[PDB]
Amino acid sequence: HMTPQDHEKAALIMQVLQLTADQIAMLPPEQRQSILILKEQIQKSTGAP
Numbered sequence: 001h002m003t004p005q006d007h008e009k010a011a012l013i014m015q016v017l018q019l020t021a022d023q024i025a026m027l028p029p030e031q032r033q034s035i036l037i038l039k040e041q042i043q044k045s046t047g048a049p
Contacts, residue, residue: 002033010035 010017010032014024017035024032040048 006036007033009033009039012036013039 007029010024010027011021013035014021017024024035027034
């Protein structure tokens, strides 16, 4: 069960996202981290275990 810290990884991108945790707060946990997943795409690399 992906720790809550990992799910809070979106918060790091939350600021850059809209710049409001309140907006992201309205997002679910199964989606919050989603930002991290999408964020990874922006990085452009693809190479995870």
